Write an enzyme that holds these catalytic residues in place. Structure first.
Site, mmCIF file in Angstrom:
data_model
loop_
_atom_site.group_PDB
_atom_site.id
_atom_site.type_symbol
_atom_site.label_atom_id
_atom_site.label_comp_id
_atom_site.label_asym_id
_atom_site.label_seq_id
_atom_site.Cartn_x
_atom_site.Cartn_y
_atom_site.Cartn_z
ATOM 1 N N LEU A 142 0.826 -1.202 0.000
ATOM 2 C CA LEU A 142 0.000 0.000 0.000
ATOM 3 C C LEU A 142 0.863 1.256 0.000
ATOM 4 O O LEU A 142 0.503 2.265 -0.617
ATOM 5 C CB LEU A 142 -0.934 0.000 1.210
ATOM 6 C CG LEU A 142 -2.089 -0.999 1.215
ATOM 7 C CD1 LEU A 142 -2.808 -0.972 2.555
ATOM 8 C CD2 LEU A 142 -3.054 -0.693 0.086
ATOM 9 N N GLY A 170 -5.080 -1.420 -6.065
ATOM 10 C CA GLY A 170 -4.305 -0.239 -6.396
ATOM 11 C C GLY A 170 -4.990 1.016 -5.912
ATOM 12 O O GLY A 170 -6.195 1.027 -5.645
ATOM 13 N N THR A 227 -10.019 -0.812 -6.142
ATOM 14 C CA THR A 227 -9.276 0.294 -5.560
ATOM 15 C C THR A 227 -9.215 0.160 -4.044
ATOM 16 O O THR A 227 -10.134 -0.357 -3.403
ATOM 17 C CB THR A 227 -9.913 1.632 -5.939
ATOM 18 O OG1 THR A 227 -11.338 1.495 -5.942
ATOM 19 C CG2 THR A 227 -9.450 2.075 -7.317
ATOM 20 N N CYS A 228 -8.112 0.634 -3.471
ATOM 21 C CA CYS A 228 -7.919 0.591 -2.027
ATOM 22 C C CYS A 228 -7.688 1.991 -1.466
ATOM 23 O O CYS A 228 -8.190 2.331 -0.394
ATOM 24 C CB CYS A 228 -6.743 -0.318 -1.674
ATOM 25 S SG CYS A 228 -5.227 0.051 -2.585
#
Length: 183
Positions: free
Chosen positions: A55, A87, A174-175
């Site tokens: 991350l 991502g 998505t993160c």
């Protein structure tokens, strides 16, 4: 147009990938290369022992707000039924930011394929679901088919591409935007 250290590293890795260099000798966590048609998503994918290390770590394992695209630690092979890649949605339109382009109905109707490049082989996945908000292990065909119906009806738009339990699915999350492709 912002030029920072992260965009330089990623632009340099895209060149090394174009020059057919062995990126595994730079980072042993490297698994494959990922690109999405009609986007700037063109990055390496790594894998750690968890879903958090990359991350805030770039491809050289240095501190980076952009991080690195990383595949879920639970996934084992390209033959898994759901391959999940995480991502960031960077403000400078990098990493998984262009997943937002699939919010556009006209862009979604266009068949933009997810491309995985691994060992000189190309795996093309046709996008069939995209929405705003993830299982890697399925006990039997019923759990997998239920997962397929779950993410298909979650899509903001009906896709002309239909998917059954005889297909393989890739998931870009998505993160938070999330899209799904099928092979």
């Amino acid at each position: 147009t912002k030029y920072n250290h992260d965009t330089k590293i990623s632009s340099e890795l895209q060149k090394k990938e174009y020059k057919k260099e062995d990126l595994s000798k730079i980072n042993s966590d490297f698994k494959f290369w990922l690109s999405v048609e009609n986007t700037n998503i063109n990055y390496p994918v790594v894998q750690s022992k968890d879903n958090s290390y990359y991350l805030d770590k770039d491809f050289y394992k240095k501190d980076s707000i952009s991080g690195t695209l990383f595949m879920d630690y639970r996934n084992k092979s390209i033959d898994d039924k759901n391959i999940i890649i995480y991502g960031h949605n960077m403000k400078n339109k990098t990493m998984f930011n262009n997943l937002n382009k699939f919010k556009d109905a006209d862009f979604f109707k266009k068949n933009n394929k997810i491309k995985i490049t691994l060992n000189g082989k190309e795996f093309l996945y046709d996008v069939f679901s995209a929405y705003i908000v993830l299982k890697t292990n399925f006990n039997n065909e019923s759990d997998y088919q239920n997962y397929i119906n779950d993410i298909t009806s979650k899509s903001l738009y009906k896709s002309p591409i239909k998917v059954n339990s005889n297909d393989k699915i890739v998931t870009l999350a998505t993160c938070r935007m999330v899209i799904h492709g099928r092979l």
